Amino acid sequence: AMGSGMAMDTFITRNFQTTIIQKAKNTMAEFSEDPELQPAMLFNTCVHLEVCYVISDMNFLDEEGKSYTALEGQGKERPQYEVIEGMPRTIAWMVQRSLAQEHGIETPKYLADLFDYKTKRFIEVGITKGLADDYFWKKKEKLGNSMELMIFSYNQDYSLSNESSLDEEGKGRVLSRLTELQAELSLKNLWQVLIGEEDV
Ligand SMILES: [Mn+2]
Ligand SMILES: [Mn+2]
């Protein structure tokens, strides 16, 4: 129980790519948060970042706004999305402001997770231990119509502001990853004590 920090630290190392982990550690230390003392926060950041990459790498985009999968596009001579999560927050805000300026659109008040070059919209991603619909409308309160929302729960429910933002195979990649993580956390008795994103 007091070893829950070390158990979560170890879990993180065994369940995520080194690249994912290093970014999350860096963002916590920007908030002057010790990952060793706030392991729940480190886990949540890792999952969030991994989901954003799972959404962004799924398709690529050409000059005229046509999308391709990685296989379809290879050799033709960018990722459909700019990933704003995963970098220091000062650099993140530079990116969001540049993207808005480049495209002649408003700059959202809050920091986005992704930017979709196809629709020219910012996207917020959320992962909840609770009901996705609840979290969705909680974010809507603050965000309004400034961004699209993609909310996923560990319990396989989800809520999307734009249903065409994910095919059923992309949804299945995200949700299956979350289901697998919850099963493992449950087996380690780490699930009940995890503080989800929706309570931060
Ligand atoms: Mn964010
Ligand atoms: Mn988010």
Author numbering: -6 to 70, 74 to 196
Sentences from the paper on this structure:
The heterotrimeric RNA-dependent RNA polymerase (RdRp) of influenza virus is composed of subunits PA, PB1 and PB2. It is responsible for replication and transcription of the segmented, single-stranded viral RNA genome (vRNA) in the nucleus of infected cells. Transcription of viral mRNAs occurs through a unique “cap-snatching” mechanism. We initially screened metal-chelating compounds by CEN enzymatic assays, followed by a cellular phenotypic screen and then optimized the chemical structure to improve the pharmacokinetics and safety. This culminated in the generation of the compounds BXA and BXM that target the CEN in the PA proteins of influenza A and B viruses.
In addition, a structure of the influenza B domain with the I38T mutation was determined without bound compound at 1.8 Å resolution. For the FluB I38T mutant in the absence of ligand, the threonine side-chain changes rotamer. The methyl-group is now in the position of the CG2 of the isoleucine and the hydroxyl group is only able to make one hydrogen bond with the carbonyl oxygen of Met34. Furthermore, in the unbound form, Met34 is orientated into the pocket and also has to change rotamer to accommodate the ligand in which case it packs against the heterocyclic fluorines of the tail-group. The results show a 10-fold reduced activity of the I38T mutant endonuclease in vitro for both FluA and FluB (black triangles). That Met34 is also important for substrate RNA binding could explain why, in the case of FluB, the I38T mutation has little impact on viral fitness.
